[PDB]
Scaffold this motif. Sequence first.
Motif, PDB file in Angstrom:
ATOM      1  N   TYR A   4     -17.376-157.740  59.723  1.00 39.88           N
ATOM      2  CA  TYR A   4     -18.371-156.861  60.186  1.00 39.88           C
ATOM      3  C   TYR A   4     -17.952-155.676  61.101  1.00 39.88           C
ATOM      4  O   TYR A   4     -18.257-154.493  60.789  1.00 39.88           O
ATOM      5  CB  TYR A   4     -19.510-157.770  61.118  1.00 39.88           C
ATOM      6  N   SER A   5     -17.019-155.891  62.056  1.00 37.78           N
ATOM      7  CA  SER A   5     -16.397-154.906  62.721  1.00 37.78           C
ATOM      8  C   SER A   5     -15.539-153.836  61.782  1.00 37.78           C
ATOM      9  O   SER A   5     -15.794-152.729  61.914  1.00 37.78           O
ATOM     10  CB  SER A   5     -15.308-155.422  63.733  1.00 37.78           C
ATOM     11  N   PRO A  51     -23.786-153.623  64.760  1.00 37.25           N
ATOM     12  CA  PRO A  51     -23.652-154.744  65.904  1.00 37.25           C
ATOM     13  C   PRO A  51     -24.591-155.550  66.153  1.00 37.25           C
ATOM     14  O   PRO A  51     -24.864-156.583  66.379  1.00 37.25           O
ATOM     15  CB  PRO A  51     -22.795-154.042  66.939  1.00 37.25           C
TER      16      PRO A  51
END
Length: 279
Positions: A4-5, A51
């Motif tokens: 994800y990051s 996020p």
Amino acid sequence: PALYSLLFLLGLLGNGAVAAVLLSRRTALSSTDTFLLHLAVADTLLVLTLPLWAVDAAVQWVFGSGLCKVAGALFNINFYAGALLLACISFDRYLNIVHATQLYRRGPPARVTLTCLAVWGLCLLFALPDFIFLSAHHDERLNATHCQYNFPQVGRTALRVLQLVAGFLLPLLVMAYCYAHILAVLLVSRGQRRLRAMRLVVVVVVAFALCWTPYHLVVLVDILMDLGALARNCGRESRVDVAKSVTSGLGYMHCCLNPLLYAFVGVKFRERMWMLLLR
Ligand SMILES: CC1(C)[C@H]2CC=C(C[N+](C)(C)Cc3ccc(-c4ccccc4I)cc3)[C@@H]1C2
């Protein structure tokens, strides 16, 4: 969460560079250049919420209802903007490559601000409902807390149908028509640049299809399950949720890829980038 990051960093870096390069021009910007810049801005705004979505899908929404309203409006505006701008870019390409003889101009920059403003305004008006209705509910089915609507189920169905027929179907049909005719014309041309032109067009169309179709297929599945055509059960609902998650992941992947498939492949933009880095 690491993936994800990593998706987040690339998305911010890619789109930010594209917007930076196009904003370093001291003169007029081609129509497709304007559309690409607006798409980059929209995608940057849309990835800013990654996020939030990840945290919400992982544990629960814990930021309150106001942040829900703001984030939902942001996401809806940017999503519709991305779809409509990807359609408008294809229409511009069609008008410039199929009717090229009927739209020749001896170097005046055709201003296209009208369409951009219309798209953004229509997107805002479409996203309006988020400012009013989206909130945080305490469900009794999952014992979790997410960000959802409080419309009647019929209203939810209407909204889902509107999303399906205004974010996927119309842009998809416009893209299909435009790019298919572009391929048809290019295959009957004479030159050494038609090859990469067809290849890039095909790659773009395939990417759009195989990155957008899954999520809207899941949305149609949900609509059908709410329309009485399909039976509700624990396993089916769980599978629908899994499909939702994975398809959203794929959509964010496409949003991160957009800069590569639309900007960095053009000789014009690469020359612009190198010149700007030199400066
Ligand atoms: C974001 C929020 C925090 C607020 C808005 C909606 C949320 C959930 N939802 C609806 C799952 C986000 C969503 C929607 C669409 C896509 C997508 C699909 C196809 C192609 C590209 C994309 I991008 C991805 C994610 C969370 C509350």
